[PDB]
Amino acid sequence: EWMPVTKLGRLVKDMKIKSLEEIYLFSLPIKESEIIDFFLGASLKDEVLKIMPVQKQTRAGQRTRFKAFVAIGDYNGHVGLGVKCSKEVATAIRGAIILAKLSIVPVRRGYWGNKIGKPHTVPCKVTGRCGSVLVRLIPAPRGTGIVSAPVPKKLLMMAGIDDCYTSARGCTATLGNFAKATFDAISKTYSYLTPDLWKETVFTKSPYQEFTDHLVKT
Amino acid sequence: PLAKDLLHPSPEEEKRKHKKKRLVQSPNSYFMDVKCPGCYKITTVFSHAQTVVLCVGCSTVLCQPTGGKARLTEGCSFRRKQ
Amino acid sequence: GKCRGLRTARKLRSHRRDQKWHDKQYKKAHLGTALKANPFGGASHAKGIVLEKVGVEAKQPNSAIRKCVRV
Amino acid sequence: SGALDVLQMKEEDVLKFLAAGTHLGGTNLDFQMEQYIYKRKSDGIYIINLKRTWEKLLLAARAIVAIENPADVSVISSRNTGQRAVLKFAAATGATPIAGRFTPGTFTNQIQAAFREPRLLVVTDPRADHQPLTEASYVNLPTIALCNTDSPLRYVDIAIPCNNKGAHSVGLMWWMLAREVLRMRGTISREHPWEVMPDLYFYRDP
Amino acid sequence: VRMNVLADALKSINNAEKRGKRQVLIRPCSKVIVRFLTVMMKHGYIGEFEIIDDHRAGKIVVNLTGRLNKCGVISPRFDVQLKDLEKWQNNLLPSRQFGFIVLTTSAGIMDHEEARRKHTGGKILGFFF
Amino acid sequence: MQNDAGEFVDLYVPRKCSASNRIIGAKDHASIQMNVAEVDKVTGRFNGQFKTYAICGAIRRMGESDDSILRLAKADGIVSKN
Amino acid sequence: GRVRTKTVKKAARVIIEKYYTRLGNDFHTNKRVCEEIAIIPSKKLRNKIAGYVTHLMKRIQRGPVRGISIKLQEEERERRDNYVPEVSALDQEIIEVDPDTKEMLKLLDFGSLSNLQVTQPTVGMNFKTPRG
Amino acid sequence: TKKRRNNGRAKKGRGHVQPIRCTNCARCVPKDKAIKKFVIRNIVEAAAVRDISEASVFDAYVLPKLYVKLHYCVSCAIHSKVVRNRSREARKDRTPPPRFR
RNA sequence: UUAAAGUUGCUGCAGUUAAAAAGCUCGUAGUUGGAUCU
RNA sequence: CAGAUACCGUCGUAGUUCCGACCAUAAACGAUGCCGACCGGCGAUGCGGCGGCGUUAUUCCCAUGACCCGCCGGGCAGCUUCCGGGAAACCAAAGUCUUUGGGUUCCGGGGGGAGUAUGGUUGCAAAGCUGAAACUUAAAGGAAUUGACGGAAGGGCACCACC
Ligand SMILES: [Zn+2]
């Protein structure tokens, strides 16, 4: 049974925060995976991307652990990407699913040409890098699909992007760096100032300040 | 840093800078007005002057040149022009 | 850096066609010295007459006898 | 003190500042802190401006007062010149002190025993206790720091230009911050002076 | 030596939006800089600027908003027919929704959206978004 | 952000920094939202209402967070002029 | 050699911290109370806890110790910390300012302060350490 | 890859530095690459400092000293244990050792 | 043979250590050239 | 020394030195083309200029020197830093780069064959410049990690080590 150990967990468990977007708006870190299970939960879906054996030399042979790269997310929503390394592959997969739940970001989705209906693509051209792998996303017309390699395609489909042109330079064969670069490119959708986000920000209370009187009862 | 005022520098901030690196180039020199004590004349001399400036009447020296600023001789007083 | 003027196309077009020659895929198909060295002469197949059956040995980490034919 | 004559510096407080020596900075200057300086005299010692100092206390006291829960401010000193001054500031105000050694992971490691989550950090010497400063930048903590002239302003948010080397000048600054937090709150106000002497906040050398 | 005064006066104001400043100095100013800066200002990217007149060649102090992502120059000023503007604004701009290409037509230094209305080609000067 | 129908297509609208107009990201944990109380005008006690400032983490890592909160308080009229 | 492991020292520290009134200096009456307080598997550990306690009780008379915390010292430090003098050390009738400090006070319109006694400034500009 | 930043040398902004020998090996190492050492010791070893003073026909006779400057090479300094290998982070600390006792 | 090949690169590559900056300087052609005129 | 046609020691021609010709190459290195703009701090240093307490000498005064405290300009460098880059080591340039365009020269295209063969040219020669292909290979290689090894150091231990 969940017993929350942070102020944010005590607020989420007691129904005091009504969405994940409040926790995103006030930029707060998430330290418990059951917050993501509380909000998204039954709509989240994960895929293990790679199980990678790594080997430390000792004087008695080689010591072997297994890293697992787990992508996760809600189609139309959010995406995570976690890497855990352990002595057992099931333990690595479970720790990687926890780590992929905790690194869940929101993706901003825009339109290619005319603004009719719901968003479908990236808002602008965003890039993302991880150690000599660049990934660039380009906005695409309604219905072209993700035009990309198979490994960023899982992350872009889990994000809820329906169509996108892509390009990758670098040693994309190292799958962890290629996963960790398209995740970086779809993180920069919500930190790019387009001219509709030029309105002056109207501030509201932090969750820690709004519920400072319920948080002393516990 | 990160919010200075470049339109309006302070008057000590203007005088610190190089004469070409100010907001508008101002020269660092002037024209003095040297009075030789042994005579009664008035001879306008540049401050950073080169080779020597002799009086027309007494035909003696006023300022021998130096590296930057021409040094006056002894007894020669000066009142700066405006 | 690269030249970047607006009247620099002769420097650009002729730097490339000298730099194209250091491409071994380019050179082996444009120099002509490796198509007079090819036994076919740029055909997909060819015919011949078997001289003898020499069988030649496999390379290092794996052992067998590859049976060949001297044509 | 936004041109309010109720909050202006009185004649007695400057006598306290000059008797403790808060106006005397170090022998160096950070480039962030040149705004708070008056001039450098002979023998190198920079003279800290005091109309600038009194406005940074009253900015910081507004920051502390604007927190509802009085025990969400976390008040920290690692040098022993501010370890009595912090337990007595947190006694009269209501804050939570960490005097002594700040073990790392106090704000990040949620499994730990000494885990707490403040809403505002007050430290005493950003050269010395940098480890609560860099650990604040993982958990979104605004930060007051009682800052000297040669003490760098990375991750601090409103750094009071005081002299944090002398033992009297630290205790007086904590006394002024406690006084202004209590006065700007609902407690005993600006007419009669505070009966808690500032010598309570000083450091006792054996 | 200083070939291209508009190049050094845009990477002066590019490098200071990175560093977070609120004002740039850009010496020297030509009048192609003041026309380019007025196009960025009219689309809300820059804000008000002041032309300091020494007798040599002016300097400009530009007040910056925090709204400019990138400011760029194209070198050389290639000629752009109006039937070839789509390739240019697909190679240089981040989306179909924002960002402008500045080109110098015979009707004046303008955007690409203005140059489409007045039906004019020109030479590409640069871009901003 | 809006379609032709005027409806809002956004998960949320992020807050920008009060100093530099940079978007404060979702996982930018070095960022600040700081409340500064307003005092009563004649007695100097806590009014109830406050001013809010947000500082992005890159400015705060630069060390320019002290002189940003200060000159944002000087424009809101909390710090007295000079 | 004779070093006490973490078991002896941890047990001795808790049994000092909880039962300081019964412990004294005699190892023998320390052993007779350490076998009535605690449940130790027997003697060769019981006499090692009671010996570090007998070495640790002599260490408390000479001052505090950096581990345990006992409430005969931590009331005396409390009454030592709530100590105010009669007239404060900031009530000086003649306080010394520089020439330039008085100029800052005149900027702050505190030139009418009467207690300030401006000192003669230092004649030499000699403050840097002799490098080399 | 570059192990030192000054290339194990003190040449910063000239072309050629003159070559001098080594004292032990006699190896032509350049002047800002030789390990240098200045010794100030007494000319008679300190065991015989009493017996030089009893046989002194002069009163309070001062003791002259040896002043030689030693330019060891790089190879034979580490052999002679006058200079050593340090850590990757102690390599950047060019302060002299605490000789003052 | 074309794409994949941003492994010929105008768009659009590289040149400290992976292949690579001429020992240094002068210099004609080429290439490129500061403000300023309703 | 098993063997030394080497290390080590003793002699010792050309050379090492001076001048007239040639040679034009080096780990000729910062292994980093030149010109230009913008971009963090700090303390020193060399040269020149400007301002300033107060100490020495030219007997006291001026001027100069020697210091002391700053400021400006250009230099060889250094420390530092979440400026940003980079595969990293690291670099305030190796930054301002998929948000890619300031001007311009040289030059690289997997490893070998090979800087070889041939041809031309320069030179008294030695050699220098210019410079292939046939064939042959699935890797050669860069940074960094963890062991292992060292006739590398510092320390520590053992009568299955010594004394
Ligand atoms: Zn040697």
Residue numbers in the entry:
A (entry chain D): 59 to 276
B (entry chain b): 2 to 83
C (entry chain X): 2 to 72
D (entry chain B): 2 to 207
E (entry chain W): 2 to 130
F (entry chain Z): 1 to 82
G (entry chain S): 2 to 133
H (entry chain c): 2 to 102
Relevant lines from the article:
In summary, Nsp1 from both SARS-CoV and SARS-CoV-2 binds 40S and 80S ribosomes and disrupts cap-dependent translation. Our data establish that one of the major immune evasion factors of SARS-CoV-2, Nsp1, efficiently interferes with the cellular translation machinery, resulting in a shutdown of host protein production.
Structural analysis revealed 40S and 80S ribosomal complexes in nine compositionally different states. All of them displayed density for the Nsp1 C terminus in an identical position and conformation observed in the in vitro–assembled complex, and all complexes lacked density corresponding to mRNA. The Nsp1-bound 40S ribosomal complexes could be divided into three major populations. The second population comprises unusual, pre-40S-like complexes, in which the cytosolic ribosome biogenesis factor TSR1 is bound in two distinct conformations between the 40S head and body. These complexes do not resemble any known on-pathway biogenesis intermediates. The stable association of Nsp1 in the cell with multiple different intermediate states of translation initiation besides empty 40S ribosomal complexes is in agreement with the proposed role of Nsp1 as an inhibitor of translation initiation.
